[PDB]
Swiss-Prot record, chains A, B:
Disease: Estrogen resistance: A disorder characterized by partial or complete resistance to estrogens, in the presence of elevated estrogen serum levels. Clinical features include absence of the pubertal growth spurt, delayed bone maturation, unfused epiphyses, reduced bone mineral density, osteoporosis, continued growth into adulthood and very tall adult stature. Glucose intolerance, hyperinsulinemia and lipid abnormalities may also be present.
Coiled coil stretches, renumbered: none
Organism annotation: Homo sapiens (Human)
Annotated compartments: Nucleus; Golgi apparatus; Cell membrane
Record remark: domains: Composed of three domains: a modulating N-terminal domain, a DNA-binding domain and a C-terminal ligand-binding domain. The modulating domain, also known as A/B or AF-1 domain has a ligand-independent transactivation function. The C-terminus contains a ligand-dependent transactivation domain, also known as E/F or AF-2 domain which overlaps with the ligand binding domain. AF-1 and AF-2 activate transcription independently and synergistically and act in a promoter- and cell-specific manner. AF-1 seems to provide the major transactivation function in differentiated cells.
Gene Ontology biological process terms from the UniProt entry: androgen metabolic process; antral ovarian follicle growth; cellular response to estradiol stimulus; cellular response to estrogen stimulus; chromatin remodeling; epithelial cell development; epithelial cell proliferation involved in mammary gland duct elongation; estrogen receptor signaling pathway
Gene label: ESR1
Protein name: Estrogen receptor
Further facts: Selective estrogen receptor modulators (SERMs), such as tamoxifen, raloxifene, toremifene, lasofoxifene, clomifene, femarelle and ormeloxifene, have tissue selective agonistic and antagonistic effects on the estrogen receptor (ER). They interfere with the ER association with coactivators or corepressors, mainly involving the AF-2 domain.
Family affiliation: Belongs to the nuclear hormone receptor family. NR3 subfamily.
NR LBD domain: residues covered: 5-239
Residues annotated for 17beta-estradiol binding in this entry: E47, R88, H218
């Protein structure tokens, strides 16, 4: 991923974008009958498959070992889901667009114990993105930095192959950084506004980590088996027979 | 804090640095007799007082309302402790320098249930800083961004005064960003290495948030009363009689 221009990275990234999925409940039946967490859980599960495919199309991600790819995803999947939710809810003040047929507001989160607290953080993130006028080209860069950054510091020990992995990841990170600055420059930002905006975007990533951590806390004590590792492994370790 | 040059900010920041404290146990008595968590808890508590004083010397922090100052600290105090620990352990590979008389390695963390996992993250952060050759001028900027950034997105609602607060904080953030770039430029980094290094530093902040969250999780289930808010309030809401 370190020979691709800023322009090839952005195009590679927009190309790789996953689809928008729909929630699965009969829209002919009433809403008092559906488990919101079941509806949200089931939505999240189906996105995971598409996330795995997206990640293989991120420049540099497949040059990694299968084990490392599983590690990065196992660390970042909730942050990745959450930055996607915030981005599609941007133009929907006061509401989170889980799916086009599932637009939920703050009181709708009160339905499940301790959830409105997560909602409130997600909605405020969305608010910030709106206010910053985050662009679609910038968002794809952000989402890819989260995939690459979130588990780089928790690789177990550090064998020689482990060291090259980390080196490789940091070099893809630098390239996406080059790409953000490039996108900002092309949009006519002064040098100063550039570094400033880069920093405001990257600091947002610290709030998303926060919501994910909080989110895992809340999930770990609900209904929503195989380790997530093992399931990620099966999904990523695919054959090439279907070529 | 938005009329201070990059140079005044750095000097203001180095000036404000808290002291290095010592652990409190008789070094004439054996180590099998001391509660490590009690030793660590007691150390952390004493640093908190000094942290509150430091924060009042960060450019722009006291222009905030008392309530907002308490909110920022209540969100960031563990991250602030942790980035300080990582920084002083930098030149102590494989070990965390909690205090000059309390240098602990990875097996020393195994002593308390679920702690070596936190140790392992802290030590890897320290490793990264070493490898990046983080400078003391850069570290102070980072520590101040954490104070200012970590709770900006969780201010409750948003009254007019709330909006000006956020505006003010974001403007101090931009200034510290200007200061990092300035520090990097002065050190002879190319424009490119600059934005790159800014990004590598800010992405580190996402790991520190992670360790803090994990850390709160682990603390919430141990020995280590008044809300932390109330206690922060008492510490910050001081009279000026002692002038
Ligand atoms: O504490 C929290 C945390 C997260 C959430 C939200 S966020 C969210 C984001 C999406 O893109 C899709 C759905 C969605 O619903 C909740 C969501 C529900 C269940 C989730 O996961 C549980 C099941 N599963 C996920 C995929 C890997 C295997 C475990 C993930 C998100 C609400 C409360
Ligand atoms: O799960 C974890 C989390 C953190 C820790 C570590 S980190 C750390 C960093 C320092 O600068 C000082 C001591 C220190 O010890 C532990 C530490 C122990 C207790 C702490 O706080 C408990 C008591 N107290 C802190 C101040 C506010 C009131 C509550 C904070 C850090 C170890 C395990």
């Amino acid at each position: 991923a370190l020979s691709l221009t800023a322009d090839q990275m952005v195009s590679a990234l927009l190309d790789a974008e996953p689809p928008i999925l729909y929630s699965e409940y009969d829209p002919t039946r009433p809403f008092s009958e559906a488990s919101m967490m079941g509806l949200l859980t089931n939505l999240a599960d189906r996105e995971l498959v598409h996330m795995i495919n997206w990640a293989k199309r991120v420049p540099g991600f497949v040059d990694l070992t299968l084990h490392d790819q599983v590690h990065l995803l196992e660390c970042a999947w909730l942050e990745i889901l959450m930055i996607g939710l915030v981005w599609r809810s941007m133009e929907h003040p006061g509401k989170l667009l889980f799916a086009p047929n599932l637009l939920l507001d703050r009181n709708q989160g009160k339905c499940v114990e301790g959830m409105v607290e997560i909602f409130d953080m997600l909605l405020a993130t969305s608010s910030r993105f709106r206010m910053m006028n985050l662009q679609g080209e910038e968002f794809v860069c952000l989402k890819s930095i989260i995939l690459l950054n979130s588990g780089v510091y928790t690789f177990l020990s550090s064998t020689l192959k482990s060291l090259e992995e980390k080196d490789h990841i940091h070099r893809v990170l630098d390239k996406i950084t080059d790409t953000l600055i490039h996108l900002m420059a092309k949009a006519g930002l002064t040098l100063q506004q550039q570094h400033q905006r880069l920093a405001q975007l990257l600091l947002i990533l610290s709030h998303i980590r926060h919501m994910s951590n909080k989110g895992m806390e809340h999930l770990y004590s609900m209904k929503c088996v195989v380790p997530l590792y093992d399931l990620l492994l099966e999904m990523l370790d695919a054959h090439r027979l279907h070529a």
